[PDB]
Subunit: 318 residues, 3 copies
């Protein structure tokens, strides 16, 4: 039995590809609430938030895209996550692009001073506004949150409300395979631990999950924030996403990550982002992606491959 809050965040201004705002609708349509109900989760649906748009919000310093809208949407999102967490729920946020982790992690840290993050993605999303080549804020969220990067991050319009709330030793990446040269420098230079697809190929997902927990919760229990980008999966399994990168996690590795997070019993918040149903070549590819998003969330709250969720007490005798 878990108390689970669900928040829909139909937001796309962190990137340029249309349709990721329909990700919460597609995940809900795939039967998320019914699947969580069937696991025995006490649910509170906060619905799908309507973000206050910014009319005059264009290209900043000939590089940063929609900073005012991204900053504002995340400020609003942080308040809802804060409420859900302070009300004692494990907070599930449906994206929407990955810039939404600024809001979810900021809102979660308002109640958990010792929170740790497991970031599952093909990308590190740790470019600063000065290292980004694209200027898309979904490839930059971790830079605003990390304490060690405060002196490397300029003040963006709409971002003055953010306070760095996580240290370099409190975030572990899993699934990396498309990292920009400044991002690689940031990971190495600041000793941020990561398990790229190459590390998974060598160690295997079991050792990857063991080492992740040893680094984060080896010394003490801590609330875990699971920030799961659907593009961490191979594009054959998750085609409906904006930045697919070949050679991703298998369905089995993805479920394994989600199961191990459940087994800690320390899961406090989950982000499931970057499901863009409009980018799938067919309705079945949109549905496949959406169903995979439901399986990650369900496994993070007790769904297992061995079918031991619904406890049986007695077998009928003849």
């Amino acid at each position: 039995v878990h108390s689970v809050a669900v928040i829909g965040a139909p937001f796309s201004q962190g990137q340029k590809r249309k349709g990721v705002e329909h990700g919460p609708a597609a995940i809900r349509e795939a039967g998320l609430m019914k699947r969580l109900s069937s696991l025995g989760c006490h649910l509170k649906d906060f619905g799908d938030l309507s973000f206050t748009p910014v009319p005059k919000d264009d290209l900043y310093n000939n590089l940063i895209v929609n900073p005012r809208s991204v900053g504002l949407a995340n400020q609003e999102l942080a308040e809802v996550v804060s409420r859900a967490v302070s009300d004692g729920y494990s907070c599930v946020t449906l994206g929407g692009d990955h810039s939404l982790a600024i809001g979810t992690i900021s809102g979660h840290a308002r109640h958990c001073p010792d929170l740790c993050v497991v970031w599952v993605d093909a990308h590190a999303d740790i470019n600063t506004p000065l290292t980004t080549s694209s200027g898309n804020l979904h490839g930059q969220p971790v830079s605003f949150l990390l304490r060690e990067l405060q002196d490397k991050v300029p003040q963006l319009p709409g971002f003055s409300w953010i306070k760095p709330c996580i240290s370099s030793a409190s975030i572990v990446y899993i699934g990396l395979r498309d990292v920009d040269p400044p991002e690689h420098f940031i990971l190495k230079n600041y000793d941020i631990q990561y398990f790229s697809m190459r590390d998974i190929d060598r160690l295997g997902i079991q050792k990857v999950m063991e080492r992740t927990f040893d680094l984060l919760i080896g010394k003490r229990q801590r609330p875990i924030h699971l920030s799961f980008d659907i593009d961490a999966f191979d594009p054959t399994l998750a085609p409906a996403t904006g930045t697919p990168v070949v050679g991703g996690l298998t369905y089995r590795e993805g479920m394994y990550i989600a199961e191990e997070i459940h087994n800690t019993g320390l899961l406090s918040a989950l982000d499931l982002v970057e499901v863009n149903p409009q980018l799938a070549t067919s309705e079945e590819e949109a549905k496949t992606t959406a169903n995979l998003a439901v399986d990650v969330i369900a496994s993070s709250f007790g769904q297992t491959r061995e079918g031991g969720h619904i406890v049986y007490d007695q077998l009928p005798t003849p």
Copy 2:
């Protein structure tokens, strides 16, 4: 070719069961496997072949369902008493029986007939545990219940069904090992855990790897002494991308390589005595290549169980021709 690493005596049975479940099209299974080229493949491995052909099954006219759930119980139990005899015939003769399905209900017969060597051991490769009792089941389909009738520890929890009186509990808890489990119903999970039935689910394969799983499986079953092996193999243990034409497909299954590995290790013990290849449904395919892939896959599993390998070497080459 005149030289082979090993010569096996193998029998092929076409059992087109369909009354074990409700989805039609699984009867065209032994036909699709043969059309792929099974017989030609076993010949190329130097097998002494004995084809028993596609068996004829007649439905019982008055077949009322037991406890208003177990659909077609008389037709399934009657057909398995006879299928057991044909399988017991081949074993006594000194042959290795291979049954083409059809659904997984045919396993009650094959394992009972085989036991008529009593010190045998089973390897159940499936996405499903097929261990529901007639009272714990919810679908009414008998293909999800074969292991309940065969276990000695489950006799007190299984009632006497119409045409199931002939079945005697032959295999004990420590004589069955599952591989590939990913869709286990709550009563099935209670049975496995409480009766200490050793298994290797997809999660276990994810952690240990297919090599360790095979090493551990044999340490359990044939570690005490050399024993005959019954390989019951459901095509749905493989991922639906590889076996798309099947009844109950569950996402996140065995890769082609993992399934060939299981079959190769089974061959390498030299103790394989019986084999089942079920749930091939050519009617459940969206394209011709999807129907052909599942048939070609099923032939690969049986061929690997009798010598076919990735490196070759099954066929023995004497000397190279000189110019």
Copy 3:
């Protein structure tokens, strides 16, 4: 900084399936040169070689199809490879069928007699003209190069120029899954080390690469010749090829092989063969295969999944 020469060898006479002659153009259209340039490579593209046609070329011993054509084109290819290798370039040859390895390995061995070969393929390509059942020369290249097999190889027309240049201890196979009975005999009888798909299932690709380098470069550094047949990959990843065989390398395993080759710093020549855009059922299937071929070549010259190939040592500050 790697000095890389690219040679297009639009070679099809080593087999009967037409379209493989379009393999070099397909690889170049998938962005090969742009990808190598971004790695910091100093490039020289020779373009596609125009091989001298042999109009009068009848089958040898009523089996061996187009021998003179295959032999002559390889003799010409070897002169080009020999020159590029002499001029300090790591020579990338784009195929074309795998019979072109006769010319690339022959040409490379002229200036690198201590070379070793890592042969990545579903096939051993080691039938002799006397064991072949197809009569396709792309299934026989290794028999012409292997020193220990000289007494078993008859003199074919247009093949006399070939001087066996590799010993059985200097070649390692990776990916084998479709081996003919005389090929299995050669592998065992001449003690040629191999890692079939079954060896990979057991050891894992990390141990496979460690064992490969222990056998080849355990005693001294040597120039490495990587002969990569795209059909080493599973047909779902590399569909546009002549002889697809199910249960091949995953994308991750293939990148791992290439990344490990790069890490030695010894790569001296690379063949990327059997990309046949005509055999793809759709335009996307041909592009998928060509994109895969580019990833193998880029990974062999530094492309990583971690992003550390480009020098980046100082963050911009606000």
